[PDB]
């Protein structure tokens, strides 16, 4: 029992030495807090990720169905990275991006670098050239499935989209570590059978139920599961709202995590905080914290403190 704990601690130690700092963890463990992370938009998701957001210098994969929220999540990462004086690229083989939307989340679309590559190979290469500059904080690739190989596009065997992904990632991982740039690969349901193993974080994004606005019904309760996480115990999940043309309700996630930690009391429909009242029902409580940014930062401050960061 006492002679065991050492052999295990020893075992865990040489594993970390041989393969890296997150190669083994107990699921109950507190997270190793890095210097800087890219916040995701939802404090719940930031907390579910352990390190308060996305890791820098690593490969992230965000996947899920059509219109599930993955891209929304990705754009927030882009917004936050910029808000911190960072530069961001967007490799687009999908041609789906709505910048007016991106802009409302907080993306500085004017300074957003975009590329609409001719081929899968070119997409990844252009992304690599960008990464090896050292000037990028984040780059998003929309999407994996769209990374069609030159050969296929030129009418010329089958299965080389995977070889392409595999080859690219090998190179890209080293370049991402050195630069400290984060790559977000958006993926559906591909060639990302490699992506699965190169990724430090993998997020399963899904729509749970549609938010009611008196019968109009615009907005979605989004659920994300961190199915892989090399930077903190994995398998944590989070919920948060994405609102029609507004993105993730930062304030909505503040309340939810707020009550979760007991920092926000909930006597009936009344959400309460530090003796004062925030609103009756979640909508007013949400609407309160947006028109009162002072208290929203207070609550955000208190939540980070009570947890890791």
Swiss-Prot record:
Residues in coiled coil: none
PTMs per UniProt: This protein undergoes a protein self splicing that involves a post-translational excision of the intervening region (intein) followed by peptide ligation.
Pfam families found in the cross-reference section: Intein_splicing, LAGLIDADG_3, RecA, RecA_C
Xref: SUPFAM superfamilies: Hedgehog/intein (Hint) domain, Homing endonucleases, P-loop containing nucleoside triphosphate hydrolases, RecA protein, C-terminal domain
Entry superkingdom: Bacteria
Residues noted as binding ATP in the record, renumbered to the chain: 64-71
Subcellular location: Cytoplasm
InterPro entries: AAA+_ATPase (IPR003593), DNA_recomb/repair_RecA (IPR013765), DNA_recomb/repair_RecA_CS (IPR020584), Hint_dom_C (IPR003586), Hint_dom_N (IPR003587), Hint_dom_sf (IPR036844), Homing_endonucl (IPR027434), INTEIN (IPR006142)
Family per similarity comment: Belongs to the RecA family.
Function: Can catalyze the hydrolysis of ATP in the presence of single-stranded DNA, the ATP-dependent uptake of single-stranded DNA by duplex DNA, and the ATP-dependent hybridization of homologous single-stranded DNAs. It interacts with LexA causing its activation and leading to its autocatalytic cleavage. PI-MtuI is an endonuclease.
Protein's name in the database: Protein RecA
Designated gene of the protein: recA
């Amino acid at each position: 029992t006492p002679d065991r704990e050492k052999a295990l601690e020893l075992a865990v130690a040489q594993i970390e030495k041989s393969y890296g700092k997150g190669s083994v963890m107990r699921l109950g463990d507190e997270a190793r807090q890095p210097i800087s992370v890219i916040p995701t938009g939802s404090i719940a998701l930031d907390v579910a990720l352990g390190i308060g957001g996305l890791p820098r210098g690593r490969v992230i994969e965000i996947y899920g169905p059509e219109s599930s929220g993955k891209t929304t999540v990705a754009l927030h990462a882009v917004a936050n990275a910029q808000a911190a004086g960072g530069v961001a690229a967007f490799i687009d083989a999908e041609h789906a991006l709505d910048p007016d939307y991106a802009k409302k989340l907080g993306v500085d679309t004017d300074s957003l670098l975009v590329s609409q590559p001719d081929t899968g190979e070119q997409a990844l290469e252009i992304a690599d050239m960008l990464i090896r500059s050292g000037a990028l904080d984040i780059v998003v690739i929309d999407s994996v499935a769209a990374l069609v190989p030159r050969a296929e596009l030129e009418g010329e065997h089958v299965g080389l989209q995977a070889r392409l992904m595999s080859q690219a990632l090998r190179k890209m991982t080293g370049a991402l570590n050195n630069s400290g740039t984060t790559a977000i690969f958006i993926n559906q349901l591909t060639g990302g059978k490699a992506l699965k193993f190169y990724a430090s974080v993998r997020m399963d994004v899904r729509r749970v139920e549609t938010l009611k606005d008196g019968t109009n019904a615009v907005g979605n309760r989004t659920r994300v599961k961190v199915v892989k996480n090399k930077c903190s115990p994995p398998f944590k999940q989070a919920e948060f709202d994405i609102l029609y043309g507004k993105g993730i309700s930062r304030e909505g996630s503040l309340i939810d995590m707020g009550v979760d930690q007991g920092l926000i009391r909930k006597s009936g429909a009344w959400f309460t905080y530090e003796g004062e009242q925030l609103g009756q029902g979640k909508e007013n409580a949400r609407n309160f914290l947006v028109e009162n940014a002072d208290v929203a930062d207070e609550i955000e401050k208190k939540i980070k403190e009570k947890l890791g960061i």
